[PDB]
Ligand binder design. Structure first.
Ligand code: NAD
Ligand code: NAD
Ligand code: UGF
Ligand code: UGF
Lengths: 314, 314
């Protein structure tokens, strides 16, 4: 059967495509415009990996400049990953690209899916929609984003609900929690901290380093994402958290990188960035039930894999 | 103080400016680009009186193409009513203006308000953020909009929370429920049904006419809205429902119009419009507690006032 992956040249999109292409039953179309925080050179590598496989078709186009009706005629499943993802660069003059690529892009894709016979429209969202909450967050918690970025992603979720209720588009929303591993975007914490450690530079810590994340290793994220397609259960209309094996503070991660590198870190403490929560912590009860999701990669093993990728990247 | 009213030439904004100008201590700056569903001719009629007043400055400019430094200089209070408000016309190509005028406008005003010291930023939102709910809805309910329009308004609310939590912008959110009376927009039900009855044309009913709304008379709406500025108590960060004296069905309303006109309605029943709930019903206990809000205008009195306005208009 035939799967559209939007944002296929990106971090998570390229891994998702690779996993789907392991199944000879699946044909994959990737669409990507090469925009956002990751320079075009690293995305070119991603698409090169995918184009090794005869069952992959690459479309280098803006979704807002694509004949979506024609693109979707033979598509059975949409994975929608295309977005501008940076929590920290969504203020003032930088906000318009988030609205265009996170809101207008999602609305246009849904409009085009109204008269398609889809199995599933699997929309990728973010723990960023919740904002600041205590305890492990469940998917029925009133979300209040802290950043303009989070507002745009939550607007994308709400459009999914509008088109599902009015036009029976078979939507599934996955909320990922801080994904890491090989090919992680260069703007994210682990990529930056690892690169700084490799180059004997001070490690840049925003705030006091006590902020915590439910870090999700890429292979765990992708197992849950493929399960959203393959699950025996009816998940149409569900929001599902996809979170990681182990929660950690940035200080905890720095100690873990010291253990892997065998270097001691010089720390550069900078002012906290507006719009970032102090804690993320997913309740993955629902994923366990509906997807058989269980994250299995420990932070030590995951960080070592990313450490090896960074060391080879540069 | 000096009070900025965005959307000052519209249905609710024109009434709000007139009510503020009754107090000799208020100066009002109104901005309006004369867009959305109401033709410019009716808007000119909305503000003719206001412009004459020496404590009212009117600016006919797009908020996204204006010097917001000039606009916000020494402003103590912002009433943000500017919006594209049509529930039923926010699909397909018509979606872009809702994004521009409901999301980008709100973000640019909040960005401009960062380094000025407001008493209050009173953001007007809509019962359409709730979607399809049963019983009288309270402000703590998880909102799931049914329409692209309702998504864009809920995104504007979320931007208010982001700028409040990060930059201490003193936001207050008012959620109005189906406002009617003199100067009601020509796309709304009462304006359309009264114009049709006046012209001896068939009355257009979407679905079977058993849908109900919490109809809020304009004078009740404005009393609640002015109460949000005039209260000294800390309502900063609060979402407050503003609803009407009496809920009714469209068939109930048409009966009341028949008794006002002494004419019988010819009825055309059309398909239900995607994106509209079957019922709205406000819990106004929070407005009662925070604003001493109590709606006092009955539908028979309110409809006779609108009927009189519509007859005179045409
Ligand atoms: N990386 C994480 O930690 C994380 C966590 C939560 C959720 N997510 C979500 O996962 C998805 C993928 O994130 P990522 O880290 O791989 O980001 P990324 O920037 O690596 O990949 C997204 C891709 O989308 C593409 N794109 C954007 N707008 C487009 C448009 N208009 N037309 C075509 N292509 C377009 C970009 O070119 C980019 O390659 C996003 O929706 C993101 O919000 C990521
Ligand atoms: N009428 C109702 O029943 C109702 C109920 C719930 C909430 N609301 C909200 O109340 C507010 C006022 O609604 P209304 O019925 O008076 O609508 P309206 O269309 O009469 O007034 C809104 C005004 O905003 C102006 N405007 C829009 N975009 C602008 C921009 N970029 N720059 C400058 N001016 C701009 C328009 O020209 C218009 O006159 C809106 O926010 C609406 O969503 C209305
Ligand atoms: O799940 C989510 O909500 C989001 O996951 C990622 O964002 P995060 O900001 O949580 O991840 P990342 O950039 O690794 O930052 C993690 C923490 O690390 C801190 N940090 C980041 C970079 C750095 O150099 N130093 C640093 O201390 C940040 O302030 C933050 O507290 C993704 O970047 C984002 O796309 C996604 F939406
Ligand atoms: O309370 C709110 O949040 C919303 O109130 C209004 O929207 P509504 O659609 O409830 O009001 P209006 O347009 O008067 O419609 C009332 C009912 O009347 C029905 N209707 C409308 C027009 C018509 O010609 N015939 C008709 O049956 C509609 O289907 C709806 O069920 C405002 O138009 C909208 O701006 C606001 F968001």
């Amino acid at each position: 059967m035939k799967i559209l992956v939007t944002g296929a040249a990106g971090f998570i999109g390229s891994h998702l495509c690779q996993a789907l292409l392991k199944n000879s039953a699946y044909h994959v179309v990737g669409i990507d415009h090469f925009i956002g925080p990751t320079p075009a050179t690293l995305k070119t590598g991603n698409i090169q990996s995918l184009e090794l496989n005869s069952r992959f078709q690459f479309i280098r186009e803006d979704i807002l400049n694509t004949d979506l009706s024609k693109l979707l005629q033979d598509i059975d499943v949409v994975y929608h990953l295309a977005a501008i993802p940076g929590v920290r660069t969504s203020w003032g003059k930088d906000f318009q690209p988030y609205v265009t690529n996170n809101i207008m892009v999602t609305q246009q894709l849904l409009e085009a899916c109204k008269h398609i016979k889809l199995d599933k429209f699997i929309h990728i969202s973010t723990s960023s929609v919740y904002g600041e909450k205590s305890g492990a967050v469940s998917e029925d918690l009133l979300p209040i984003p802290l950043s303009p970025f989070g507002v745009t992603k939550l607007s994308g979720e709400h459009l999914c609900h509008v088109y599902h209720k009015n036009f029976h588009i078979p939507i599934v929303i996955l909320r990922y929690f801080t994904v890491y591993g090989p090919r992680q975007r260069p703007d994210m914490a682990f990529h930056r901290l690892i690169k700084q450690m490799l180059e004997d530079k001070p490690l840049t810590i925003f705030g006091d380093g006590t902020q915590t994340r439910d870090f999700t290793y890429i292979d765990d994220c992708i197992r849950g994402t493929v399960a959203a397609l393959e699950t025996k259960k009816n998940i149409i209309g569900e929001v599902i958290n996809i979170g990681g094996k182990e929660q950690a503070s940035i200080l905890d991660i720095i100690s873990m990188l010291e253990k892997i590198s065998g270097k001691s870190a010089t720390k550069n403490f900078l002012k906290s960035v507006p719009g970032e929560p102090k804690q993320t912590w997913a309740d993955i009860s629902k994923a366990s039930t509906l997807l058989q999701y269980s994250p299995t990669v420990s932070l030590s093993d995951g960080l070592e894999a990313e450490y090896d990728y960074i060391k080879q990247l540069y």
